[PDB]
């Protein structure tokens, strides 16, 4: 149980183009269920209660900002 607070870094994704990090708590068993890793710019540290403000209400809302971690954008 509890939240996985997740810290994205921002960092260069391409020229022209980057990656915005992030902070965002997750349900333990939302992300361990299914998660994405790719890159090492990121944090992570469990806890019973949200850290950040941002709370992935379920499966699909995780899977999309977990999807917002490595899609490049314009800066």
């Known amino acids: ?26 349900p333990f068993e939302i992300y361990s269920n299914e998660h994405r890793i790719a890159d090492a710019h990121y944090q992570t540290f469990p ?3 949200a850290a950040y403000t941002t709370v992935v209400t379920d499966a699909a809302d995780w899977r999309t900002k977990n999807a917002a971690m490595f899609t490049p954008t314009p800066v």
Do not use: L, Q, R, W
């Open 47 to 49: 806890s019973e209660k």
């Open 1 to 26: 149980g509890g939240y996985v607070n997740i810290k994205t870094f921002t960092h260069p994704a391409g020229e022209g183009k980057e990656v915005k990090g992030m902070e965002v708590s997750v």
